[PDB]
Design a protein around this nucleic acid. Structure first.
Ligand SMILES: [Mg+2]
Length: 293
DNA sequence: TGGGGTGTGG
């Protein structure tokens, strides 16, 4: 599941991402490599990258009119299938938090192909920040990664701007939106490959091949989703659910990691699910094959 | 800026 969003403010939203299973926001992309950036994201260097102030001698901003300036960039959030989320946090399977991360690196890398600048020329490089979270605003397991793309790419010499000027030809983000499904798709496919290799089973449960591990009590950890549909309902348009997603949206919360982890384990019991039996069933499934043909 | 739900995203 890949969702999109425009970043419209540096300093402010620059923090947002700078802020419960062990807590890794790492850089990514050929562009982030050029500027010499690796698996760490300084609150300041990032907050800067959004204004147009690269680490390199590039200051592509527009600090005019008090505080009217550049265009920060975009947020491509890949959300993992609820069963994957649960198994990692409630099932303690750390191998999953990994698979998910590899699945994102794969996707985010296919997005970099569309990296192009205005003059339209595929510049094949991006400077990105990838933040990982594991809850929903409803406080449930909801592991996802905000692949924040900085509004900058590198053409021939200096850095330009992915974002466009005026209409001309569809620039970067235009194609991203035009290609959402494919991206959420191949992210989901990568996670899939690994997850099954670990010995887990999966079945389709939604459009464009969305899936989950069969048997895992998903319905019980989809509080946001349900609150959104109890409001605007089912059969509601995507746009209508966008607004619902925002109204009924609780505000960002300070949870007591162990009070919450316990509520989950507790609520997890009432479903009648045997977490342990599942991981083992998966192991035996994986073991059973790698030891045959 | 278009579009799948696990619903994130000043
Ligand atoms: Mg988040």
């Amino acid at each position: 599941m890949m969702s999109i969003a425009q970043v419209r403010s540096a300093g402010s939203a620059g923090n947002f991402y700078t802020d419960v299973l062990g807590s890794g926001e790492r850089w990514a992309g050929r562009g982030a490599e050029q500027l010499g950036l690796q698996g760490s994201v300084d609150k300041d260097v990032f907050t800067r990258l959004l204004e147009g102030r690269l680490p390199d001698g590039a200051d592509l901003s527009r600090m005019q009119d008090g505080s009217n300036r550049h265009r920060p960039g975009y947020d491509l959030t890949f959300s993992a299938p609820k069963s994957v989320s649960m198994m990692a946090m409630l099932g303690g399977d750390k191998r999953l938090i990994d698979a998910h991360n590899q699945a994102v690196d794969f996707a985010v890398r296919q997005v970099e192909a569309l990296a192009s600048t205005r003059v339209t020329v595929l510049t094949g490089n991006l400077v990105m920040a990838l933040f990982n979270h594991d809850t929903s605003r409803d406080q449930e397991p909801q592991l996802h990664t905000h692949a924040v793309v900085a509004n900058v790419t590198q053409h021939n010499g200096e850095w330009k701007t992915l974002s466009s000027d005026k209409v001309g030809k569809t620039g970067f983000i235009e194609n991203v939106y035009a290609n959402q499904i494919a991206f959420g798709r191949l992210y989901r496919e990568k996670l899939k490959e690994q997850v099954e290799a670990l010995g887990y089973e999966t079945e389709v449960v939604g459009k464009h091949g969305m899936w989950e591990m069969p048997g895992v009590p998903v319905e019980a950890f989809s509080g946001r989703s349900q609150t959104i549909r109890e409001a605007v309902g089912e059969d509601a348009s995507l746009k209508s659910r966008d607004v619902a997603a925002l109204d009924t949206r609780k505000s960002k919360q300070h949870v007591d990691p162990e009070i919450k982890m316990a509520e989950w384990m507790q609520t997890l019991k009432e479903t009648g699910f045997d977490i342990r039996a599942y991981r083992d069933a998966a192991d035996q499934r994986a073991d059973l094959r790698t030891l045959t043909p």
